[PDB]
Amino acid sequence: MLCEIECRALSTAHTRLIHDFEPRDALTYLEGKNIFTEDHSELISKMSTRLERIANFLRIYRRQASELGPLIDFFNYNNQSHLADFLEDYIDFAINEPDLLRPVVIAPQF
Amino acid sequence: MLCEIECRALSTAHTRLIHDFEPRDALTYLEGKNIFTEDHSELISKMSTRLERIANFLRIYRRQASELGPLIDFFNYNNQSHLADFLEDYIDFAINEPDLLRPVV
Amino acid sequence: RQMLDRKLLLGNVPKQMTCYIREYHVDRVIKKLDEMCDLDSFFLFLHGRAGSGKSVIASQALSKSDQLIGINYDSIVWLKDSGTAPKSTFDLFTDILLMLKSEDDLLNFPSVEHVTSVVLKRMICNALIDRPNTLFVFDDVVQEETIRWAQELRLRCLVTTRDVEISNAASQTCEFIEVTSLEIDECYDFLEAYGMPMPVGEKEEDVLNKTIELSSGNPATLMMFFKSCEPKTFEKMAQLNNKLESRGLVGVECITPYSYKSLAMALQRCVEVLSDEDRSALAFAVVMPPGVDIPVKLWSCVIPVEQLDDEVADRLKRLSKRGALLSGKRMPVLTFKIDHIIHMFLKHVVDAQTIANGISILEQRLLEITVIRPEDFPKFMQLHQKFYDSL
Amino acid sequence: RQMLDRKLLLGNVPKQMTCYIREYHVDRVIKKLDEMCDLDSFFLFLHGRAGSGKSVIASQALSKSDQLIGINYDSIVWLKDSGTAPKSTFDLFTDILLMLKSEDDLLNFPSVEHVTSVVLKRMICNALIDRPNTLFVFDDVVQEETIRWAQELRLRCLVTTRDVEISNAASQTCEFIEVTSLEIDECYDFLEAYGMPMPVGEKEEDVLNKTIELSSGNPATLMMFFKSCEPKTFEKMAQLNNKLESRGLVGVECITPYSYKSLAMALQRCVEVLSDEDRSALAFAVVMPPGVDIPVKLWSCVIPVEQLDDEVADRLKRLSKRGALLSGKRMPVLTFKIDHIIHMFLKHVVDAQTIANGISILEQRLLEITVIRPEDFPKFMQLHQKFYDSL
Numbered sequence A: 001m002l003c004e005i006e007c008r009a010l011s012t013a014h015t016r017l018i019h020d021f022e023p024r025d026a027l028t029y030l031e032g033k034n035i036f037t038e039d040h041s042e043l044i045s046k047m048s049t050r051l052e053r054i055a056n057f058l059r060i061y062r063r064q065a066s067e068l069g070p071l072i073d074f075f076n077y078n079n080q081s082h083l084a085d086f087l088e089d090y091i092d093f094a095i096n097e098p099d100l101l102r103p104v105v106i107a108p109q110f
Numbered sequence B: 001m002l003c004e005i006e007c008r009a010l011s012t013a014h015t016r017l018i019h020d021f022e023p024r025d026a027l028t029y030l031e032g033k034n035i036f037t038e039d040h041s042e043l044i045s046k047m048s049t050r051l052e053r054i055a056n057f058l059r060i061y062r063r064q065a066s067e068l069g070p071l072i073d074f075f076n077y078n079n080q081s082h083l084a085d086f087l088e089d090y091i092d093f094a095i096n097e098p099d100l101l102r103p104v105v
Numbered sequence C, D: 001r002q003m004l005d006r007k008l009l010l011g012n013v014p015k016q017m018t019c020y021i022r023e024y025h026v027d028r029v030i031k032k033l034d035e036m037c038d039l040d041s042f043f044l045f046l047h048g049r050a051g052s053g054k055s056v057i058a059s060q061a062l063s064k065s066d067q068l069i070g071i072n073y074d075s076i077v078w079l080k081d082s083g084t085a086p087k088s089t090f091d092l093f094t095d096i097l098l099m100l101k102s103e104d105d106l107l108n109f110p111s112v113e114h115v116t117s118v119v120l121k122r123m124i125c126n127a128l129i130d131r132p133n134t135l136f137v138f139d140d141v142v143q144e145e146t147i148r149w150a151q152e153l154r155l156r157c158l159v160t161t162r163d164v165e166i167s168n169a170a171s172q173t174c175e176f177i178e179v180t181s182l183e184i185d186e187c188y189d190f191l192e193a194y195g196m197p198m199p200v201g202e203k204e205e206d207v208l209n210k211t212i213e214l215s216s217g218n219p220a221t222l223m224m225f226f227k228s229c230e231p232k233t234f235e236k237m238a239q240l241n242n243k244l245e246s247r248g249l250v251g252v253e254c255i256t257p258y259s260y261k262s263l264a265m266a267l268q269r270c271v272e273v274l275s276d277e278d279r280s281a282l283a284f285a286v287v288m289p290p291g292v293d294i295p296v297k298l299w300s301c302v303i304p305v306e307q308l309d310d311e312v313a314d315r316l317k318r319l320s321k322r323g324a325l326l327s328g329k330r331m332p333v334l335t336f337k338i339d340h341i342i343h344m345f346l347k348h349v350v351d352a353q354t355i356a357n358g359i360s361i362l363e364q365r366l367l368e369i370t371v372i373r374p375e376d377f378p379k380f381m382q383l384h385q386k387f388y389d390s391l
């Protein structure tokens, strides 16, 4: 499982994961890095709308991974690096520099 | 682009690159050795906090250089040699030996 | 400012008052809430007398600043407690399970009631992962068991109550904001806001004053009185005040937004919960001058029960804490004061005969053998003869 | 350190205390548990007196060291027992079946009511596969049937209980850790932790040892005394001790993180479970010198039932091994002692008549032709006349 920090990130960066993203694109990369199952990919892969595949990808994902690695190491490869960069920035304004998360990486999207 | 070794180094020696360093100091030396662009230096040069200029210097850098040379050859000149020495030590405990950690504990 | 309203409505939060607002307090209930974000599982208590206006302030404190919802906390859950039965502390959480649930699967709602607590509790903290930093408002807590569970659920919530003792059972730190009686200057504003014959004449000013006195700043009962001004006349206000020191809130009772049309109906509940032996102590505390700073010994005279006359003080402190019925001033000397509002209700609901005997006992113990000092003058009935003759 | 909290919360484990933490013990409950990682289906008993603080220590022992959860055991299941009915030992396991179950299929959970014991038991050890490394905490056992269930299913257990004899039924791994009365030196720290005024004047210091002698190291009723001392002054403490010598624990009774407002309310339950004939023995213990090492024959005088006076001692041993109601020593001579707390409990509970009756019986057997030696002077010893006067 993740936690409040790693799940708060998937939620904060949600206005964005809706405008450009697709869970079908990540299913192959995750059945692989060992974080899914052949029913998992079935469940998220056959979904009429994308907000469905997205809400199932973010639900299923928060349970399966020991951390938020194999999803930054994916928006990179998928030419959606403007995404994996935002999330890695957010994970950094928490461990090393505390406090700075709310003024810097949280407010500019109110 | 770099790779996992050269990027694992910029990450391992990260507790340090936060306590004493500054991307403004290196921008001139890198627009020069041909590894940046006048928008690159603009993007990292106008940043309110340093952890911003640092995270952008380490993101932008990992894409641009064919290797991790023009950053050891900089902490040297910048009186921050205690840095370029740590990173050159790390690149050596992998360049001169074919053995590390495997998938373990 | 349109997303809030979506979130407010769905969290069952009432609309804030707009005509008149206790800014300082609303502005003090928002501040303390902002200070608590990183810290998880916290209690904010708005302890106050019955109808002291606590619940309205939570409506406003979550309705003025839009930061509280969206910026500081993602969602809101506002649930009214008012639980007295032992099943109530469990029933509240069943209503807090479906609240937290999705619009989908309210159809598949199971018999959660026929499920054990260890399941309702686990079942809640199992779905609570959906919403992080969730704020829960618990309008009107009477019992303490809820807190016991909540602390087992590592929960953070705002709390409107008339008592404060429950925190002792709790052990995760707490903060507090007391809804005091409406200050004199403030009241005026409240009236003007609601529109009242503007105070202008002397005898009238002196007549408008009397009004507040009886209410003694209780917002709810300051509303319940204002609604008795159909003629919109200060003269009428005088008339009502006169009716009060005789008939009591009963005559001034009226339909109001508040839960209790009559404040005596509210305070009832504050007199039932009261410790039984402690209940007696209070019951004989209706023989003292209203709104007067009066000594402990002078009280030792009417109150039931060696140099343990301190027992009088213990009752007066507990009674002042539970329901904030009483109030004790530490300095210069340990003295309490039966607020007119806290005084009239008891007077009308209790036994005059008890008070009569009570008054007798008072006089006796007094005989014994704003700077009042009956230390050397305990036996001073005439002092409040105006009050005593009433008995 | 964020994965634990996930695991603690889901295993329904309460938050560990922080103001005051025991050590040696917590460090002795962890050690023995590590030794038994290889061992399976073992019992750890935190046998101790009531309100003596056992349950809090399990909260801390599973909350300080993160190894216990993750390193030594994979998951935690902490369930409060408190079962008295015969259906209770079955009901506990129904709550331990859903605990062990998945978040999925709590909605599809069938009716355990129809499920029989052979089924609930088989049904549990059938799903227990998906949890090989699982520790179960059974806060507050007061029965043995549960121990039998555990022996049957081959299972691991931390156990908080007051009565230690329950383990006799089982024939598996059994170790023990006793939560003693808080030592004198320790107490100080506890109060210091709670910011109790610091001892300064000899007279004020005089009070210090006394409350302890009274509270005989009972954390709960120490917490209760603290909830009482709002003034926070040694004077307050003295006054409360006074109330107690005149009001028992009722005087110190108050709301607290304890499920119980009064300790007498707790100990009740320790006097109901008692063997009918053992109940009497306890009931007469009131007429004894409190916190005093006193001989068996001395007790033979008040206790109900020839050379077989050993039976009286038997009663004293059994009574001492059930919630630690009694306390006895072996050397120099077989003697017991009625902890001040239990003595007060007895005094306040037993028929006002019996107290005199018991002392009368003592007198009836008081005649015959710390190094107390009444073996040679029992007939003519009244060293506890002080206490005797209390009767």
Ligand SMILES: Nc1ncnc2c1ncn2[C@@H]1O[C@H](COP(=O)(O)OP(=O)(O)OP(=O)(O)O)[C@@H](O)[C@H]1O
Residues within 6 Å of the ligand: C017, C020, C021, C022, C048, C049, C050, C051, C052, C053, C054, C055, C056, C057, C140, C160, C161, C162, C219, C220, C221, C223, C224, C256, C257, C258, C259, C266
């Ligand atoms: N700011 C306010 N503006 C207008 N009316 C108020 C205000 N505060 C209190 N009242 C009066 O009190 C009634 C509700 O009182 P409120 O619920 O705010 O007090 P309370 O402390 O919650 O009492 P309880 O604890 O019994 O819920 C309203 O119907 C109104 O008559």
Ligand SMILES: Nc1ncnc2c1ncn2[C@@H]1O[C@H](COP(=O)(O)OP(=O)(O)OP(=O)(O)O)[C@@H](O)[C@H]1O
Residues within 6 Å of the ligand: D017, D019, D020, D021, D022, D048, D049, D050, D051, D052, D053, D054, D055, D056, D057, D140, D160, D161, D162, D219, D220, D223, D224, D256, D257, D258, D259, D266
């Ligand atoms: N380490 C501690 N720190 C603070 N309070 C304590 C501590 N230990 C015991 N207490 C007091 O005892 C109460 C709970 O006692 P606890 O549950 O630990 O004892 P217990 O042996 O479980 O009693 P029972 O067997 O009846 O459950 C707390 O509310 C607190 O007042």
Ligand SMILES: [Mg+2]
Residues within 6 Å of the ligand: C055, C056, C139, C140, C259
């Ligand atoms: Mg209300």
Ligand SMILES: [Mg+2]
Residues within 6 Å of the ligand: D055, D056, D139, D140
């Ligand atoms: Mg307990």
